Amino acid sequence: GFVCNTCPEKWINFQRKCYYFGKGTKQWVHARYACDDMEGQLVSIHSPEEQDFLTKHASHTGSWIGLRNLDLKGEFIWVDGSHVDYSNWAPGEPTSRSQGEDCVMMRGSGRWNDAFCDRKLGAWVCDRLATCTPP
């Protein structure tokens, strides 16, 4: 009903969402399926507060997030279909002169870099909606 902050075991709540901080070497598409199979999707980020929460729990060696140049025209969009209403790109990113670097990762600093999708990273972040306590 009113309060939406219930998360499944091993997921961390932040506002109306649950986040899973995944570990293990995976290319972007593998991380995408690892999230799907846990009933989540690679994370989408919509505010500086959500980014600050992610930065605090983010792996120091980089993590895949759910942003990708899906339409192959240079427009990076969230795989969950949510609005691109916030960005935390590292300065000068994304570059127009980086053909094939269609996937996005988050650095230890929390800043985003585009990357080749077949790059193997040690971390990945899933999100899903929190469920609600009945009033």
From Swiss-Prot:
Entire-sequence positions represented here = 157 to 291 of 321
- Highest taxon of the source? Eukaryota
Q: List the disulfide bonds.
A: 4-132, 7-18, 35-126, 103-117
Q: Which protein are we looking at?
A: Low affinity immunoglobulin epsilon Fc receptor soluble form
The record places domain C-type lectin at 6-128
Q: Per UniProt, where does Ca(2+) bind?
A: 93, 95, 113-114
Its taxonomic placement starts with: Eukaryota, Metazoa, Chordata, Craniata, Vertebrata
Task: Give the encoding gene's name.
Answer: FCER2
